[PDB]
From a paper:
In this study, we solved a structure of a PSI-IsiA supercomplex purified from Anabaena grown under the iron-deficient condition by cryo-electron microscopy (cryo-EM) single-particle analysis. After processing of the images with RELION, the final cryo-EM map was determined with a C1 symmetry at a resolution of 2.62 Å, based on the “gold-standard” Fourier shell correlation (FSC) = 0.143 criterion, although the peripheral region of IsiAs has a relatively lower resolution. The atomic model of PSI-IsiA was built based on the cryo-EM map (see “Methods”), which reveals a PSI monomeric core associated with six unique subunits outside of PsaA. IsiA1 was identified at positions 4 and 5 of the PSI-IsiA supercomplex. The remaining three subunits IsiA-2, IsiA-3, and IsiA-6 could not be identified as the cryo-EM map in these regions has a lower resolution than that of the overall resolution; therefore, these subunits were modeled as polyalanines. The PSI-IsiA structure lacks a PsaL subunit; instead, a C-terminal domain of IsiA2 occupies the position of PsaL, which inhibits the oligomerization of PSI, leading to the formation of a PSI monomer. Once IsiA2 is bound to a PSI monomer without PsaL, oligomerization of monomeric PSI cores to dimers and tetramers is inhibited by the N-terminal IsiA domain of IsiA2, which is located near PsaA. In the PSI-monomer-IsiA structure of Anabaena, there is a polypeptide modeled as Unknown in the position of PsaK, as we were unable to model it based on the sequence of PsaK. Unlike the typical PSI-trimer-IsiA structures, the IsiA subunits are associated with the PsaA side but not with the outside of PsaB. The characteristic fluorescence band at 684 nm originating from IsiAs decayed with a time constant of 55 ps, and the corresponding rise of fluorescence appeared around 727 nm, suggesting excitation-energy transfer from IsiAs to PSI.
Residue numbers in the entry:
A (entry chain D): 4 to 138
B (entry chain B): 520 to 593
C (entry chain F): 24 to 164
D (entry chain E): 2 to 62
E (entry chain A): 11 to 752
F (entry chain C): 2 to 81
G (entry chain B): 372 to 445
H (entry chain J): 6 to 48
The structure:
Amino acid sequence: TLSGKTPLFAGSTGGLLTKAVEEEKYAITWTSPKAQVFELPTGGAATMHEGENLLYIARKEYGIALGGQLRKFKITNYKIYRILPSGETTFIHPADGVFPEKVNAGREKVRFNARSIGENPNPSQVKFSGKATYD
Amino acid sequence: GPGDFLVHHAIALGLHTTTLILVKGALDARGSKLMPDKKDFGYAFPCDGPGRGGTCDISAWDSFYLSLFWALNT
Amino acid sequence: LGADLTPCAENPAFQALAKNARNTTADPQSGQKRFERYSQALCGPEGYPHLIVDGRLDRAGDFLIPSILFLYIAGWIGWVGRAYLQAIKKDSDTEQKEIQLDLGIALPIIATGFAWPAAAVKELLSGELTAKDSEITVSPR
Amino acid sequence: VQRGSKVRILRPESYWFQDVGTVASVDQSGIKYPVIVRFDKVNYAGINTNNFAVDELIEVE
Amino acid sequence: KKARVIVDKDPVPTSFEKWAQPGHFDRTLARGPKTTTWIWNLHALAHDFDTHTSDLEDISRKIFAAHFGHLAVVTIWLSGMIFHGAKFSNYEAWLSDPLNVRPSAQVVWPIVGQDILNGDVGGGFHGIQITSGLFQVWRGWGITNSFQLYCTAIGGLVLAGLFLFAGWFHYHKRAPKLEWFQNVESMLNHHLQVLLGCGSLGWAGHLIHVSAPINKLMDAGVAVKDIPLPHEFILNKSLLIDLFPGFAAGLTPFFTLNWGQYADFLTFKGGLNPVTGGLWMTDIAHHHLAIAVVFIIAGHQYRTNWGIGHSIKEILENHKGPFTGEGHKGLYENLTTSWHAQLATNLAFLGSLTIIIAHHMYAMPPYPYLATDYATQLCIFTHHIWIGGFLIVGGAAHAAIFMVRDYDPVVNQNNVLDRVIRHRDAIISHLNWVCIFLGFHSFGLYIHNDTMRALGRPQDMFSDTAIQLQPVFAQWVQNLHTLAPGGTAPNALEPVSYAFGGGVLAVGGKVAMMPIALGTADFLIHHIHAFTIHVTVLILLKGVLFARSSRLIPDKANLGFRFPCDGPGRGGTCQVSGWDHVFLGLFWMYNSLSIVIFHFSWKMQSDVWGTVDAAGNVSHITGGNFAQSAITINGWLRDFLWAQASQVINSYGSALSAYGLMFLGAHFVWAFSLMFLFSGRGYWQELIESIVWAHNKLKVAPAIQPRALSITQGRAVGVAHYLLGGIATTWAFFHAHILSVG
Amino acid sequence: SHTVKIYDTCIGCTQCVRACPTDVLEMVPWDGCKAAQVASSPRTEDCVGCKRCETACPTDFLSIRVYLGAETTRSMGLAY
Amino acid sequence: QAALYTHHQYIAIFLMVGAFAHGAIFLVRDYDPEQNKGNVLERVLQHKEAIISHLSWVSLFLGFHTLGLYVHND
Amino acid sequence: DQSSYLIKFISTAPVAATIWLTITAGILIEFNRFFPDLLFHPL
Ligand code: CLA
Ligand code: CLA
Ligand code: CLA
Ligand code: CLA
Ligand code: CLA
Ligand SMILES: CC1=C(C/C=C(\C)CCC[C@H](C)CCC[C@H](C)CCCC(C)C)C(=O)c2ccccc2C1=O
Ligand code: SF4
Ligand code: SF4
Ligand code: SF4
């Protein structure tokens, strides 16, 4: 499903280790208007192609970091995918196609506490219970 | 004599400063201005990150750690 | 008082030290003048002046007089310092007046710092020395 | 409390807890912390403003 | 394009306004202080000109003006040293009796009993004995009276004035444009040919016309008053002919290539003058002449305005091979657009040069009556090693600052810099390994030896009398250098240094220099040096190579050069910044150089320095205990630190008492540093909260809110006091010891 | 994994979301503040515990908190 | 005699640091403000700034003058 | 005015401190020069 040619000068010792084969791997795709030089997540000046680029990355933070650099190149169409050893590619960023800093209807509040941080219980109150003070 | 005077006053300094570190550690264990919700993070934790000017050695445990240097010095 | 203390003018160890007394300053009699002054102190066995700090009036020069003179100068410095801080807080650019002294404000305060004990008592007995505990920032308990 | 009113903070986790701040504005809506209070001294993050609920404030002026 | 003078006129109006506006230079600081962090930031950012303005031209002008400022303070210092020589010294007494009189150029005022520090230094003079070697410098210069020093001091104050004016003028009045600054080819030409070449030719002039004659007469035992003034050797040729017959020939032999006619005042003697134990002035003369010619030739390499010459960009671009892709392409842009890239280079290589100078100056003492002044020898070696080590770490810092701030991917794609970034894991992993290998097979041998000696098994030790580790290569090189005169250096009489071999040379009763034999203790300590240098490089290289990113923090370049961490996440990211690698490299630089100066101190005192019997038997200062003692840590603790610290600890009630006080003071400052290094900001901010509460309670709470030092400042203050305390301790130790035994 | 809780003192400035180097956080509709949006932490399995979000948060005290919990490969920031 | 005095003084120092460590662990994990409403422990926590500030003073006061006199003498 | 700017610079924390502590040091050094070795107030 992941289309895009690997950028030129993409090679370095900072690339994928055995984790990429055994645990999980990430990909970041983006469409460039023009072939241009960009710093790789783990060092080395790579060259983007005009059109679809595919870069495999060890960590999602590499994708978000590179994403931030692509924004400085006026590129906001970058998609990060998590890839499992079974070849189960999962589109993970942006989750719902809209960037998380922009508000999108349909998203529900997760881990919201309807109180000020000062109104948390004391650790003594939740002692020998399953719950924590921030629950 | 005078030698015993100066060193007893060094020992006093030692006892007060070890106490200062430990009492401050104890009485700020639940929270402070820098970390008001410190009780939520427990006794030992590394820090609360470099925000708010930096919070290295902010936990109650980190007062124990600092105090033992002074305990040994004393 | 105790621990083999004698008057320095009676201690043989003192006289032995006085005969080979080093000149502190350019004055070539400064070495002898020192031991002439220290003769009135109490000396230990080795012939060094030991100071008695128990509030004995015959040893008032040892600690009691230095104490009064220090507390008067230290209290001056503290009062003048406090006075200036309170003076600049009534202005607009208070933080700038901390790192860049308003000598117009500071020098009069410094001049009138001689009368700090009167000012300290007056301000203690007016409830103008301290702030209320309820009006001072504190940590969550 | 309204615009210009000096207020003391009652929020115990506030940097300015029991410190006086000036009310910059009060948001006329149903929001939980409508009163924007400015302060002379900055907190550890270096900000000098924060939103408070009316119950967390005591008008002093 | 053509190198030319192009300046803006009146770019910055001169006014005291901004002097009354602390932090004017930074937009953030300009708003003013709110917390005490502002006061630190002011000083921290003061000379960080890249953060003042974005404009490279404005930065270049600030840097050029600041340099005139630093030249002015260095000239004030050098003028002060010479003035203190002219007014408050026993220089003239020391000239009359170099071997007996002790150099002193600092007199203390009689106050609170500190006049004790004015010890009997000889020449009916009371002052602090100086270890800076100024007297040996001035004797080498051919200065023979206080008036010549006064003239030189005043001349210096005028030059310092000129340097101040220059800095004001070249910033406020006529500031060069960026075009001017980026003429690297013209700058290299002028700095090679004029600064170094003409400076060396000029100095050859002074040596040949003034120093060599005056020193030759002083070595012939002629009284200082009886020696003619330096201008009398020019005005009266007959006097100069009598010392150097070659001057009879005049200047025609120079122009007709009959250079052998100058063989008497331009020599290749080698070794040392037996009278003074310093290098021959005639050798030094020929050196500076030869240097001058090579420099004046060298500085015609780079193309300026006449087509002839190399462009450095074309040289760099052409040097590429099958391992290095584009090779040195793009490095010209790095070094001509980044001041940090130039400062990195210049600090790294000036630092490396200063350490070479340290070595070359002890082994080949260039000044008269330096070799036998064991206090001066130890102190100038140690001094220049320290300066060297700090400059090298500065090189690494500014290399990392370049990588974070000024590195461009576009300029540096598939070049040597780009390709090192791409195998940085392979570089650091291998350097990590060689550090552990050297650590085990250098330090572990000391631990082996300590344990064997402790277990009563000296036969099982790594020693000359047990399992030998002879440095055969260094031994072989010493031999080659000893056989050089007559062989592979036919026109040399003696070796370059008696350290390599030849005889013991002695001046007065004392050894100037003798062969420095290398054995197991010398093999072990050399592999300790290799270890401690490789670990410092590991830290600093890791700092530069991982400054921009790592497998842990991909966007480290965005966090900047100097940030404390990226929080307790990822297990904890404390000290990942390039700044924090410099911080850690300083401790290792300190550890490394400490063992270098300790090595030098003990080896020289045990195996080189000492008295010489009429028969010719050498009695060394510590009686050759290095071979058997310096092979265990216990031996270093006992026979070096414990043994030689006796002078500094027993110095109270004497002229050396100050070193005893400095020794304790420095031990204190060092220990104080551990408060900053072992603790964290969080604790101190919470303590300040309670102290601020009490000041609030009595209405003395400052408007500028007190803050605990930044995480980075905590570390900066830590390492500052640690280095100050540690280095100052050794300084007090070395002085008190060597001013007693040496 | 680490736990990231948002508190009702949130003003919906979006600075925590922008700061986050592993897209843990996102803005969701809310009626509680004027900005009419609140921070949420749907993807805390991707949280490394850097606390950049807390450094970003302009409220006193913070409206976002990271409680460092069970360390995993993702939370330890391991590429191996 | 030297061994036995040093031994027990070192143990005493560890026990004393532990006392304060576990006192801080109590405050952060076990202490219920509601159950200790109005008692001596709540009051100590109410003026903890006053306790810590006066400990800071005694430490500084001892430290400055004791190091002072030693350095004067030295 | 350039006088006003100098006075502001002189009154700046580090310059003001330097002048004041130099005067304080000067007073202490000179008192000890003319009245050395005062371990206590004589009676
Ligand atoms: C006007 C200035 C002033 C005054 C009246 C006080 C008063 C006090 N201080 Mg504070 N303090 C000050 C400045 C001042 N301080 C400064 C500048 C610092 C930073 C070093 C501190 C750091 C400090 C600490 C760490 C502690 C105190 C404590 C205290 C209290 C106990 C006495 C003491 O320990 O002295 C301590 C004295 C010093 C640390 C040195 C003071 C430095 C100079 C001499 C003072 C500044 C003078 C100023 C420049 C004058 C300008 C005046 C001019 C403009 C007219 C007492 C309320 C203690 C406390 O909380 O007790 C309950 C305590 O632990 N102070
Ligand atoms: C020619 C040499 C040279 C030059 C021109 C520079 C220039 C610069 N350095 Mg570099 N640096 C150098 C050598 C040099 N450095 C060396 C040798 C080292 C190794 C220590 C470094 C390590 C270094 C670091 C780690 C950093 C810099 C930074 C900088 C920049 C800001 C400096 C500043 O604002 O200081 C302001 C001055 C101070 C804060 C005061 C310093 C006082 C020191 C710590 C102690 C002095 C003690 C003294 C020796 C003994 C007296 C003690 C007595 C007073 C008690 C500036 C571009 C900073 C930067 O960000 O670059 C962009 C930065 O973070 N430098
Ligand atoms: C004595 C104090 C001390 C010691 C022993 C160490 C040791 C080490 N440091 Mg550390 N360091 C120190 C102080 C010390 N440091 C301080 C104060 C700082 C703060 C500045 C640092 C900061 C620091 C940095 C920044 C770095 C180091 C690194 C290293 C390692 C270098 C590699 C090496 O030589 O391995 C060989 C091991 C030794 C020399 C230790 C002794 C080995 C013994 C003699 C042999 C083993 C005996 C036996 C088998 C023991 C086990 C048996 C037993 C269980 C029965 C080494 C483990 C570097 C590193 O990791 O690179 C490889 C590195 O980059 N250190
Ligand atoms: C008197 C009885 C006593 C008891 C019953 C406890 C019980 C407890 N303590 Mg407390 N404590 C005590 C005394 C006691 N402590 C003392 C005297 C101190 C001062 C040091 C402390 C300081 C302290 C701290 C700071 C902490 C505790 C904690 C705890 C709890 C967990 C301990 C644990 O799991 O660590 C497991 C054990 C270790 C990690 C032991 C390793 C350390 C040893 C000393 C290493 C020695 C080095 C080596 C073996 C020597 C080599 C020799 C050489 C020649 C080669 C547990 C409830 C922890 C807690 O969270 O409380 C709820 C906690 O953080 N204690
Ligand atoms: C020699 C080592 C050393 C020294 C001198 C200090 C000193 C201090 N520690 Mg620190 N500490 C140390 C090691 C040291 N520590 C270590 C290894 C640790 C483990 C991390 C700590 C952890 C620690 C903690 C956790 C605490 C302390 C505290 C203190 C202060 C106690 C107050 C006091 O009694 O003294 C009075 C002050 C001094 C003795 C300071 C020196 C005075 C100097 C010499 C005067 C300087 C004036 C002179 C003119 C300046 C010349 C310099 C020039 C460049 C201008 C004191 C400042 C406590 C504190 O702050 O209490 C208020 C505190 O809570 N320390
Ligand atoms: C002791 C210590 C502190 C406390 C030290 C502080 C806050 C430094 C303050 C000392 C200076 C000297 C205060 C100067 C105040 C005034 C300028 C003095 C005015 C009076 C003079 C004119 C005489 C930290 O903040 C810290 C932070 C991070 C890691 C470790 C540590 C650390 O170890
Ligand atoms: S440097 Fe300090 S604040 Fe940063 S992660 Fe480490 S302990 Fe925490
Ligand atoms: S701690 Fe770091 S990774 Fe986790 S939510 Fe906050 S910013 Fe994102
Ligand atoms: S949690 Fe803080 S930073 Fe994030 S949106 Fe809310 S107020 Fe802004």
